[PDB]
Design a protein around this ligand. Sequence first.
Ligand code: GDP
Ligand code: MG
Length: 636
Amino acid sequence: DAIQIIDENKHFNTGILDYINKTSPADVGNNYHIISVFGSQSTGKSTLLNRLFNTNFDVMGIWLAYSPVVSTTLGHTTSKSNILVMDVEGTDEDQDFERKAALFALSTSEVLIINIWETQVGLYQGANMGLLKTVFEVNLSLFGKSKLETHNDHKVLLLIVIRDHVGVTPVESLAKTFTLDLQNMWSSLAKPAELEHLQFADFFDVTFHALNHKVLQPKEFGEGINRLGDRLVVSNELFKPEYHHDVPIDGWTMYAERCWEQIETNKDLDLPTQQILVAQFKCDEIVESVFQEFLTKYQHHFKEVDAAPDFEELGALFADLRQDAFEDYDASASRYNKAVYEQKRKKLRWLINDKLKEVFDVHAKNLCNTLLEKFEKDLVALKGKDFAVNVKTLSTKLVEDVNFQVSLMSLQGDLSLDEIILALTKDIDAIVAKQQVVELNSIVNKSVKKLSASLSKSIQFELGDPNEETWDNVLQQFKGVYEKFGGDFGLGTSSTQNQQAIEKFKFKSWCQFYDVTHKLISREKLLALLQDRFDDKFRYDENGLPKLYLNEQDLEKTFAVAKQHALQVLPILTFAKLADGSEIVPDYDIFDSKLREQFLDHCFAEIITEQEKLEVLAKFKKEVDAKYIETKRSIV
Ligand SMILES: Nc1nc2c(ncn2[C@@H]2O[C@H](COP(=O)(O)OP(=O)(O)O)[C@@H](O)[C@H]2O)c(=O)[nH]1
Ligand SMILES: [Mg+2]
């Protein structure tokens, strides 16, 4: 059963798309053929179509039908190209319709069948060289521009069926005559100057087929048909790929609709660009439908944010999803124009690659803040021990297995890492700058304490035998370990702030020097020291044996000797001075307001004040007097 694709009011049939869908399976693609038969009314057109292609047009607009089977001398044959057939009746008057219908047929058909009667071959009378000339014109206008400018090999086959052939004239003889009439008419056709050189054969192939008298030789007529079949489908002698219009079957209705609308409204129809447009439209909607198949298929994974992040197991789902999309797209779209098809595939690629990249970023720095957290941790756990290097080694393996782990889910480099490492880097550097200040300050603090611990034991030893050179001995030691700190830190320096860790480490030192001297030489200690010096000479022998006073010359004179021995030490301990007589001045004037806690008025060298010295002397005397009185009550 046949469908009218164009009725007499030049309207295009809406049902065509569904009609094509029924007769053509998803399989066809480019392997189909369009054949048109073109002629004035009742010249055997529907009859030839029904007998040859087995199609059901009515025998006494434009009608389309699928051919289930071709009539051949090998019987009913199904070619494996789908064959569609158009019955084009250009007259019923009108000359406008004729031109339009012929334009349609030539913009969609690979073969044009022209039925001409014999005794009337070579004459409008019962051929229409008027009809052929229209075909020549319509063909030139459709393909003359392409042919000149690209030299494309496109042709259409003219298949001339000679009807009611009797046989006194051989078909070979009729063919030669008619061929030369054809070329002649072509040469004389109005052409632009620059196509003047093109011939009939640059646009057309011809061949002939004689059919015997339908009414008077029915058996032979049947046979001649079957033989046309052999030519079409059994011997595949007629169809050629250079006749084929490059639009797969699924784009065909769109192509036919667009061609007809331009034709009907007298617009400039250009078939190359119209074929590109249908390809572009169709690949586009395959891109979109596939990309939507890829998406609810996506969501049902990726804001399911998930438990245990495996990077190779699903770094390859990325591949699967993207590969299955490629395959559903290749299936429908590869039939289309190569350039259009690949272009829109890339479009599909960089739509998939961008919603796959949002999972890329999430699972990525979830692993960065997972690894930065433990980075940060055993930095601290590496308790300041040689971070000279031990930053560089830790950053290295870190920055490295991020690369490894995350590469698993990039696609041979499609989703770039350049962004993510550039972040992981700055989050690593801005946290060595974190704890560099911690460990810089840390080595300051402990360097200060066993400075002060050494200072304290230096002073203590010196206290046993105070000389006018005991401050010398104290400052010597101090300034010694004072200059042994710096440039030796196992960190990233800052030539500047390596050395201003140093710079008042040098303070806290000066500060400590003051604090320790004043602790170790407080009134209370000084007094205790004085009593010890005193007893050493008043309570014991040189030997160290407890003393036994007999006389009071003995007591009184060693009493004087004991006191002086003790007090000879006061002028030295109450004020920090070297033998030269010079006051010890701290390098930094401490007790300064913001010179103090910029780094975290008294006298630094005054160990004991006047007022304190006077209290010490009063207390020294009272005690020393008592020891005296007693050891004299025990002499009697
Ligand atoms: N003598 C003769 N008559 C034919 C031939 N083919 C068809 N007819 C007759 O011509 C009439 C119209 O044919 P038809 O197929 O409807 O021509 P169409 O209108 O152009 O499709 C029918 O009655 C056919 O029987 C032929 O080859 N020879
Ligand atoms: Mg008809």
